[PDB]
Amino acid sequence: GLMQFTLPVRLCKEIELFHFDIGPFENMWPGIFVYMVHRSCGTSCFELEKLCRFIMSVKKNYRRVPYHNWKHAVTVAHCMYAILQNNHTLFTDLERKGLLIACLCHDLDHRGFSNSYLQKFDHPLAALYSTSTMEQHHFSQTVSILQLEGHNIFSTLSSSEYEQVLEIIRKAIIATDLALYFGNRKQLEEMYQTGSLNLNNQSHRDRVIGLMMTACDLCSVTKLWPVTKLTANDIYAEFWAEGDEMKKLGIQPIPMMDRDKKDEVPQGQLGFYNAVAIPCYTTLTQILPPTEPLLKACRDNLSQWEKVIRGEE
Ligand SMILES: O=C(Nc1ccnn1-c1ccccn1)c1nc(C2CC2)ccc1Nc1cncnc1
Ligand SMILES: [Cl-]
Ligand SMILES: [Mg+2]
Ligand SMILES: [Zn+2]
């Protein structure tokens, strides 16, 4: 084990920045993930042949959708790598192992439709899982892939460690259900402003990981303006396809899903940054101060959407 993963000089420097873009070459994203696992966790965390097989099976179970795709999985994992590297003392061995995997797997088999669409559509998954429908499916896909021959990347753990890391992965994946994030964030806010927040308490760790998962999931709003602006076209391409499908069920979609309301997108982004993204990163900065650059870049993007609304660009 004296073959080590390296990146070209510009990726080696810029991968440490919260606002790194992983680029348009798909065939380099497996290498970037392994590199992040090797520096984040260690070169000994995983057997390379099992990890490589796991990564390729995960890639094959993401779909060709505009936003919730393979590129989003790796991007979310990289934001988690940055949080882990800038808070290295706060996490256990199992948390480092589970969290990069949770992030790579968190939207497995996404079709670009919300839990709401699956309910209104009466999709079979909505019968199997009444709440966090898609997020329960993604976890179930993660478990199927882990049960494929040659894919048990946790084979060096004891039974009880394996079980714990799969419980970290399950809870991290359920927490990417944005309907759960409002509650979780309000609870961490109270806990922080009263001084009861305690990282030796497992239920509090769970809440902090939950919040890290939302931060990583939304991290597209924390890139430099030209990345953030281009990735918004991709999320809206999904939203408008879901609103089309709502219209096909005879249901008026919510405004952000109506492609006839395309001109109100800038006002939509403000609403989202003020109600969801800014509070999300403010709280995360309060709990993990070295994540400040996520909040900063999010503020800068909010500032850019305000410039668009006043016709300055
Ligand atoms: O824009 C987003 N949502 C949204 C638009 C209007 N209202 N609104 C909203 C309000 C309340 C609740 C939920 N969504 C958005 N949503 C999400 C996850 C699906 C929720 C992830 C990223 C997103 N944006 C984005 C922007 N720039 C670059 N990449 C991504
Ligand atoms: Cl879609
Ligand atoms: Mg999701
Ligand atoms: Zn996601």
Side-chain angles (χ1 to χ4, degrees):
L2 282 164
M3 304 178 220
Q4 68 163 184
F5 277 65
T6 76
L7 295 180
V9 157
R10 183 204 57 87
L11 277 79
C12 163
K13 290 189 183 168
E14 291 186 0
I15 201 176
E16 301 304 318
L17 299 170
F18 281 102
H19 72 261
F20 181 59
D21 184 82
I22 70 187
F25 300 102
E26 301 208 316
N27 293 164
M28 296 194 75
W29 304 334
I32 287 163
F33 185 73
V34 171
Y35 180 84
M36 281 184 310
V37 165
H38 282 184
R39 297 189 80 265
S40 183
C41 189
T43 61
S44 47
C45 280
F46 297 111
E47 214 273 278
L48 192 59
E49 199 187 356
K50 290 194 153 238
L51 178 61
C52 283
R53 207 140 44 214
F54 181 78
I55 287 160
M56 296 318 289
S57 290
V58 168
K59 166 180 176 98
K60 192 212 303 184
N61 285 273
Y62 278 84
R63 289 163 169 268
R64 309 297 191 160
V65 292
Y67 178 76
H68 284 104
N69 51 39
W70 173 231
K71 183 178 193 162
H72 171 72
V74 178
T75 294
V76 172
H78 163 273
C79 186
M80 179 66 73
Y81 170 77
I83 298 183
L84 283 174
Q85 290 302 258
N86 296 277
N87 299 280
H88 55 102
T89 61
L90 284 72
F91 294 106
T92 63
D93 291 328
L94 292 181
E95 291 175 350
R96 290 196 229 95
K97 290 195 206 210
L99 285 184
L100 287 181
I101 301 294
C103 283
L104 198 71
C105 294
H106 86 274
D107 272 330
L108 262 167
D109 194 32
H110 205 296
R111 281 151 264 92
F113 299 116
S114 75
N115 290 335
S116 284
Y117 184 65
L118 297 200
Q119 296 161 31
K120 304 277 209 154
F121 181 89
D122 206 11
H123 190 285
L125 287 174
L128 200 51
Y129 319 115
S130 16
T131 61
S132 293
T133 299
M134 283 303 293
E135 296 75 24
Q136 285 196 76
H137 181 62
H138 308 317
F139 173 63
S140 190
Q141 290 277 300
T142 303
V143 176
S144 321
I145 295 178
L146 287 167
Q147 284 173 176
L148 291 183
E149 250 188 315
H151 291 65
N152 185 16
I153 61 161
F154 302 125
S155 57
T156 70
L157 301 185
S158 62
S159 279
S160 76
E161 288 183 312
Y162 180 92
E163 187 154 342
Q164 278 176 72
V165 77
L166 265 131
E167 199 54 20
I168 298 169
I169 295 164
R170 188 186 66 70
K171 277 160 197 163
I173 288 193
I174 302 309
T176 63
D177 184 358
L178 199 66
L180 289 190
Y181 146 88
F182 297 99
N184 186 53
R185 194 218 49 100
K186 281 159 196 153
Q187 220 85 357
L188 279 167
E189 194 49 46
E190 284 197 58
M191 278 181 189
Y192 176 75
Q193 271 187 339
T194 63
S196 46
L197 180 69
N198 170 32
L199 302 179
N200 309 332
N201 184 336
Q202 195 51 61
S203 60
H204 291 195
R205 275 181 110 65
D206 292 359
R207 287 200 178 286
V208 173
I209 292 165
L211 187 56
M212 283 160 59
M213 285 306 294
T214 305
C216 288
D217 205 8
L218 298 180
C219 75
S220 274
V221 308
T222 72
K223 304 305 189 183
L224 296 195
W225 171 245
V227 179
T228 298
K229 187 191 152 199
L230 292 159
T231 304
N233 302 348
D234 294 339
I235 193 55
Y236 274 97
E238 305 208 341
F239 284 171
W240 294 333
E242 180 168 340
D244 292 348
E245 291 305 321
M246 290 288 203
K247 291 177 178 166
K248 288 188 187 155
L249 282 180
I251 304 153
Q252 258 284 146
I254 67 171
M256 76 191 217
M257 299 204 164
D258 188 346
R259 75 171 71 248
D260 299 332
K261 296 212 204 167
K262 175 171 187 177
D263 295 356
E264 297 151 55
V265 152
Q267 190 50 62
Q269 287 305 287
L270 235 60
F272 174 74
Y273 279 64
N274 282 316
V276 186
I278 284 289
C280 169
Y281 295 108
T282 307
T283 317
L284 184 72
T285 291
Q286 282 168 193
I287 301 179
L288 303 178
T291 72
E292 186 135 25
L294 296 169
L295 170 60
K296 178 166 181 317
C298 185
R299 285 183 189 299
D300 290 359
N301 285 325
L302 171 57
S303 137
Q304 289 303 77
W305 284 110
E306 269 158 349
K307 295 192 187 161
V308 172
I309 291 174
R310 302 191 297 261
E312 317 190 11
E313 74 175 312

